[PDB]
Amino acid sequence: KQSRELKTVSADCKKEAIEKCAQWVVRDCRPFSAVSGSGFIDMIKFFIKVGAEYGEHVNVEELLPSPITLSRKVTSDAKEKKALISREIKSAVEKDGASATIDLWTDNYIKRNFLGVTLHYHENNELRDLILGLKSLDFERSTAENIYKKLKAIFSQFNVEDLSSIKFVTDRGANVVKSLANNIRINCSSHLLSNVLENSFEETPELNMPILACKNIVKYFKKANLQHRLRSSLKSECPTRWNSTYTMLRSILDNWESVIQILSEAGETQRIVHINKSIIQTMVNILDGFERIFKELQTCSSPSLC
Amino acid sequence: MDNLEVKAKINQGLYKITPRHKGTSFIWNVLADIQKEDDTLVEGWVFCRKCEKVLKYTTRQTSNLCRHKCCASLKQSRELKTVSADCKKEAIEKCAQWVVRDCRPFSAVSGSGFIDMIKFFIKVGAEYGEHVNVEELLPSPITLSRKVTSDAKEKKALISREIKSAVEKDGASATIDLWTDNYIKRNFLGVTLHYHENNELRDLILGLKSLDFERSTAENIYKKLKAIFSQFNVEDLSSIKFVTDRGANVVKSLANNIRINCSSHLLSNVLENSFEETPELNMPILACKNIVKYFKKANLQHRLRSSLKSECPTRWNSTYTMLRSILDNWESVIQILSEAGETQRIVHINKSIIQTMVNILDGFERIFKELQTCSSPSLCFVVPSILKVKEICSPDVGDVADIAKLKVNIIKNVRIIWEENLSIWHYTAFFFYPPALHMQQEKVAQIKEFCLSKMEDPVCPSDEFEFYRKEIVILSEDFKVMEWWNLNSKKYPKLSKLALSLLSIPASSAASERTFSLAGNIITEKRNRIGQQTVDSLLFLNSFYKNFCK
DNA sequence: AGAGAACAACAACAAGTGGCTTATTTTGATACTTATGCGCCACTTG
DNA sequence: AGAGAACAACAACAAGTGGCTTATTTTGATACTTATGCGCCACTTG
DNA sequence: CAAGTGGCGCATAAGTATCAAAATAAGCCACTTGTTGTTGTTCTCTGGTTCACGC
DNA sequence: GCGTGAA
Ligand SMILES: [Zn+2]
């Protein structure tokens, strides 16, 4: 028990420590998992070190800065770290090995347009990934020329002048297509397969009718607050998110007994019984195969091109 | 040289002095400057108050001025032992890693609880050296939840005695409300409590318990509130003053007890009725609504210099700030509409009516702000609100006849909505105003026997009531009624408790709105599995720390 | 061839001052870049 | 396809009083050698 | 006379010893409340809004 | 010109 190593404390210290932690958590309205932060324990290390080395009569308030200082410091560190890393960035991109995915996104509240850039490349027995930056296209309407200028500006402030050897795996955005016509443009496999599935469903209206029935049933569930007695609540109807209807099918067919029991006295049981379960499990298995394909192929931490 | 010249002139007395500069540093608490004979400040040089030597002044830097011998001795108040610049550098560095690695807001470091934690941690580190294992010291969130629940239980047990002590003296003002969350569709029941013990009202929440998922009904509300009061072992449940506006099932449940309407939502409904009866002013508001939607649909908000406000969240008439934002930047928006091809929309609206409506609705906003105050008592200034809204809506020739129609609608709605729904308790509260020269009508006639009957539970009550009737002092700008009868409590030992109870009744029930907003802050899209017990415990602890602690 | 004890004529030495060129620090006003800090001021959000 | 956040359900647990036989140090005491001065006091000498 | 020593024990004492009857901790186990810990489950987040444009 | 879609 504490064989002369990094020392422990008594029970009073633990009690008062958790008292202080509870005080902070309840008073400042922060998430509970804060005390498990990776940087939080490092800050605790620094503070206990400083306190031990400088006694217990120091001005705690003065040692802690203001948020504006934090912003200036993080900006300065951003500039310094970018300058430090640009050398290895140019070294890696010079050797024809540099792969980057490009896609734009619109902000939810202010709707400012942005563009993000990352990099996938192999340093030493591993594929190193770091995001290069994320710059906004002001407020002007999006165009291929602006995207091309912004990307060359980012690569240039990171000391890149080739813009030919690097690789892109992106969408079929015609503006993006004309943006980088001098290099390769590879269609996103996930997006291609999503289009394939959309075409697959849309050519069979007879079997699309069960999908409409199921989505209107989950609408009936969410509209009347009927997920309360259900053992496992249902998910979103149609978010256009890589066949969320697959999860809908799994949930519906795992609570089929409960939903039929509920709808027997609800008067809508005639609608569900129109479709037999066998075809439903068959397409569930097909979507199981497709979901396995998704989870194996869609991976940024291991090779998947093979 | 210039300095010798100005020194000689000021010593001869040709130039005068100015000792204070309104600066945040301590150097100007001793240092001073000079002004010329034509009331012009001296630039580039300063003057000391003890050595009487003219030193240089620099706008870009003042460090050279603090090493002077006269200002050296003053320094500043002794502080706890400080460290060098390096330690601060590594401190801000580690704080930068903390704030970047956990996606946390920057203003987290300035929290009071964080300061308490760092004080504790620096103390324990100084006590037990530099080799203490930190990972065992920091607990896990499950322990945090268990301990906060237990602490909520024990704090409630401790305070229930003083809730009883407050309720026995008939001070039992507390409002209830219902609200729906955003993601679980659960319905939560919220209730606060107000009482006076230590010369200001105590704002705290009794609790917030969820009524499961079963269908809303009067019996569920009554049993829920009965249980909530039962955790404090309270069975009176009759002298509690209720403030709910138009909750139909809620009113039906508590119809046996004392019920009082809510003034804020009443006034909002009065404004709604007033604007409903004038279509000529109804369609310009709709035109402004469509104009705002036109900007918002195609994110045309970038061009404008001051973006428009939210349309109408049913959150106390946001159309005020909506029309303010529209009016105060009219030229730019009408230009944008000019090249937008939708120029026909603006023809229906004129600026003068906009500005007059801005004036009157800003008056209504001021009324809202004055009446809605949780900390200070606010029940007294209610009838003067009706008087002021009456006098502002004076039918004149300056306004258009349509504005006269709107004013007539306001007066009709306030006459047939507000005063007929006003309880005698509001009259009693208005009566205690120290200058009572305006009212000598039947209201005092009724309040006489009302107060005499209520206070049943030499030293004659009627005689001291007329003694209060004679004493009259006009209002001062910094006057408070509560401390006024705190001083007069010796003069009237029994009526003081009655007036304290009356002044403990809030004008409205905005406390429930504040609690619901706080709960919405607690429950976010990213935190949704949180339980009702934890929410209630957190809210109770926050309210207790804000109210009853230091 | 010891040994013990004490003057004597010189005689080779220090403790305690001034004179002094010639450096040898200390006190002090001031010309700048450069990393912190309140405080309105929003201000856009729902 | 990671992203944070958080319960419920069952294992798991150090923190604390009470029996207690087995080492073993404090105090105590009798018991006995070495050696260390204090003062008469002769006990001399010149 | 007086500065020097033995002497007569000589009353004292800082040393040593061993013979008893007590004052303590160590290793284990009792056992009863309260108390902390992984390891599961369950609900959202990003996939997306009109322009390059050829067909 | 208007899908044309692939976002
Ligand atoms: Zn001075």
Numbering used by the authors:
A (entry chain G): 78 to 383
B (entry chain E): 4 to 460, 517 to 609
Paper quotes:
The Hermes DNA transposon is a member of the eukaryotic hAT superfamily, and its transposase forms a ring-shaped tetramer of dimers. The Hermes transposase is composed of 612 amino acids and is organized in four domains. Architecturally, the Hermes transposase is unusual as it spontaneously forms a ring-shaped tetramer of dimers. All hAT transposases are predicted to contain an N-terminal BED zinc-finger domain organized around a conserved CCHH or CCHC motif that coordinates Zn2+13, but no structural information is available for Hermes as the constructs used in previous structural work lacked the first 78 amino acids.
On the basis of the SEC and MP experiments, for cryo-EM studies we selected the 8 + LE-TIR + 30 oligonucleotide as it contained both flanking region and the longest transposon DNA. In order to resolve the interactions between the BED domains and DNA, we performed multi-body 3D refinement on the three best 3D classes (regardless of the oligomerization state of the transposase) using masks to divide the transpososome into three bodies. There are also two DNA-bound BED domains (in green) that have been contributed by the B dimer. Thus, three BED domains bind to each DNA. The two LE-DNAs are antiparallel, with each TIR interacting with a different Hermes dimer next to the 3’-end of the other oligonucleotide. The 8 + TIR-LE + 30 DNA includes the TIR and STR1 through STR4. STR1 is clearly bound by the BED domain that belongs to the same Hermes protomer (A1 or C1) that also binds to the TIR as indicated by distinct linker density between the BED domain and the dimerization domain (DD in Fig. 1c). Furthermore, the STR2 motifs are also bound in the hexameric Hermes transpososome where only one equatorial dimer is present at the position of dimer B. Therefore, we conclude that the equatorial Hermes dimer B engages both its BED domains with the STR2 motifs. STR4 was not bound by any BED domain; rather, the 3’-end of each oligonucleotide (bp 36–47) was positioned similarly as the TIR entering the catalytic domain of the A2 or C2 protomer, with bp 47 sitting at the place of the TIR bp 3. In the LE-LE complex, although the two ends were antiparallel (an arrangement that clearly cannot support transposition), each of the first three STRs within the first 35 bp of the LE interacted with a BED domain originating from three different Hermes dimers (left).
